[PDB]
Amino acid sequence: IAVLIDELRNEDVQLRLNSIKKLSTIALALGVERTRSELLPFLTDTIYDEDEVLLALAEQLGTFTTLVGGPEYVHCLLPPLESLATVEETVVRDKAVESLRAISHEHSPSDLEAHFVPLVKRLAGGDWFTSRTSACGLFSVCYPRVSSAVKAELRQYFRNLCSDDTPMVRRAAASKLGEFAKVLELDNVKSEIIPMFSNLASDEQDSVRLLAVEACVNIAQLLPQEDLEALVMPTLRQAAEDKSWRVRYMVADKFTELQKAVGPEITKTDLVPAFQNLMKDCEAEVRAAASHKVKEFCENLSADCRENVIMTQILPCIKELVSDANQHVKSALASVIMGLSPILGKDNTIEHLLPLFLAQLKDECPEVRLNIISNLDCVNEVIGIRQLSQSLLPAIVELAEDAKWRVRLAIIEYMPLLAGQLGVEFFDEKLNSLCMAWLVDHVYAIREAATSNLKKLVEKFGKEWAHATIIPKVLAMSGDPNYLHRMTTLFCINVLSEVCGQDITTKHMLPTVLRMAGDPVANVRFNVAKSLQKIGPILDNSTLQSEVKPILEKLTQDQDVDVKYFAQEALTVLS
Amino acid sequence: MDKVLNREESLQLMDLLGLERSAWGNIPLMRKAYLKKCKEFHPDDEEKMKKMNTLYKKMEDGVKYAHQPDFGGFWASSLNPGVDAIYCKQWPECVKKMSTNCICLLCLLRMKHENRKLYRKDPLVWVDCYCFDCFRMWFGLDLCEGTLLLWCDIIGQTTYRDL
Ligand SMILES: [Zn+2]
Ligand SMILES: [Zn+2]
């Protein structure tokens, strides 16, 4: 009610949207009678403003059927939509188109013939390529239910769009072909779609050609497994070795979608060789695109000649994409290669796959190893344990020393997950100096997470090991001539005492803390006081009275206020 | 440009120039590829020699309409940019979600477009407009530092049109 018809003319400000496109409430109060012969006409030729108002309007009108009267008057909605379906702005048209399809199911079959179809034809025939690219998306939805003769006319108007003066509309049409062929009858896919397909399949512009591939997937699935060779296959086979990488990039990328869509056997004959070439493409981002689909491509090879083709055909190629000159190609493989284990068995994974699995692991490229470290999912269950250690030493050592702070973060971050899969045995001498050269790390969040490392390792390794290996070296920091490192000793203690029991905190840890309370640098000293308070609730009734209390007391008499304060409060937090 | 010839002609004229069929819309290529076929005529098979003509003359005029300004000029202009003309002025910026306190041909033409599209209910296309967006639209081209070089290789050869 209130603010309404007056608010629809403002100054085209996004303050007049909050309530404008709330038209679901306006037309509910305007009544069905008025809404139709008043609101709709208004909304047809009064407002055409910004790409944000119109895009809200296009959306709205696709929800106006039960509000303009019902399915009987849906046709009244067409004009304000057929209008919007013409705005230069792509995102408005697409919504108009999206909303025209929704309401096109609300028409009776008769109303489609009377109204919808004429609309389509005025768009399709228009001078504005904008009008025309909107038409392409509307054939599929009014086709199945219109008359036998109307269908016939609709295929012309499409055929026409397929051969447009403007590349924008051929692209449009290409991209809508597979959708449209799906509601056609076979008689016409074979006769009328295929030629149209054939002609975008091979087109000056590769922007058009590039889009033939997904129609190729779409048309294949329609055609019986015995026509593909005559109709789909020469195009597909040509698209694969196409002049332009943009096109070949498509086939590689939609390859596994192309394999099932084409059938078990045709895969064996045409696809497997055509897939070897993509893996050997001169353009790199094609080789990668095919590397990403290698592992799927093998899981869908018929359940018998798997062992065969994977061994005889795929594997030789894989052996090269490992030795590839490009980081994106290798890193693609490193993140799939080892899913070949379930299908090759166990004898062959040791025979051929491990030479491969351990080649990537020797790679100097950081991103490569990470992925190979990250995938111990289906290779953890099949292959050995001590095997990994051969090149997992340099692997885990170089990664932790990578010039990129945020790679180092990763293995640090990984370390707690490498306990439930490598245990007390693997973690040894030449690896803990690693887990602690991180505490002296210049970057900050690495020191943060490398301390988080010891608390996560403790919570996974009881309180036994700590006293033996770690703590001896954590305290071997309280001696560093650089005060920032002495400090690390305390922060490093402050988190272990959490999960260490009363024992080890009082015995090997405490005598160190008190001993640092004499640091010539003030910063350390107040961190002593702060550190005693985190380790408060853990100690004994008489340990706190004997050795902890008499230290804070001498700390209070400090020529550096900071020390007395954090130490004043320590005394108050623990009596 | 879509309005210059139709598909049937479009391809024919491109064949009679021995020009990669993909290059319709590139006026300066087409021009010079025709000034190169004419060097193979006179006392020079010959039925093509006057066909390339009939086609090419029809396109020269269609293109002359494409270059007519809106409203007949009622309601920076010499010849070919040349010298140190400034086609872009920062790579991503002038092109992407622009930062616009400049007048580089890219930013000028872009202003020209969003100024004309105010009174044109019509959608604009290549050789009506000449802005990057219209170009990148016509050929099938991806927003990249290659595509800019291609565009401003045709602009460097077009005579100050729409300024
Ligand atoms: Zn600029
Ligand atoms: Zn433009």
Numbering used by the authors:
A (entry chain A): 13 to 587
B (entry chain E): 1 to 44, 48 to 78, 85 to 172
Give the article text:
Crystal structure of the complex was determined by a combination of molecular replacement, using the PP2A A subunit structure as the searching model, and single-wavelength anomalous dispersion of intrinsic zinc atoms in ST, and was refined at 3.1 Å resolution. Four complexes were found in each asymmetric unit. In each complex, the scaffolding A subunit contains 15 HEAT repeats that forms a horseshoe shape. The four A-ST complexes in the asymmetric unit have essentially the same structure, except HEAT repeats 11–15 that show substantial conformational variation (see below). ST contains an N-terminal J domain and a C-terminal unique domain. These two domains sit on the concave and convex sides of the ridge of the A subunit horseshoe structure, respectively, by interacting with intra-repeat loops of the Aα subunit HEAT repeats 3–7, which is also the binding site for B56γ1 in the A-B56γ1-C trimeric PP2A holoenzyme structure. The first zinc-binding site is positioned between two roughly parallel helices (α4 and α5) and the L5 loop, coordinated by four conserved cysteine residues (Cys103, Cys111, Cys113, and Cys116). The second zinc is located between two roughly perpendicular helices (α5 and α6) and coordinated by three conserved cysteines in the second cysteine cluster (Cys138, Cys140, and Cys143), with Cys140 and Cys143 from the N-terminal end of α6 and the conserved His122 from the middle of α5. The position of the indole ring of Trp140 is flipped between these two complex structures, mostly due to the intercalation of Pro132 of ST between Trp140 and Phe141 by forming a hydrophobic core.
Specifically, SV40 small t antigen (ST) binds to and perturbs the function of the abundant protein phosphatase 2A (PP2A). PP2A is a family of heterotrimeric enzymes, composed of a structural A subunit, a catalytic C subunit, and one of several regulatory B subunits. SV40 ST consists of an N-terminal J domain and a C-terminal unique domain that contains two separate zinc-binding motifs. SV40 ST binds to the same region of PP2A as the regulatory subunit B56, which provides a structural explanation for the displacement of regulatory B subunits by SV40 ST.
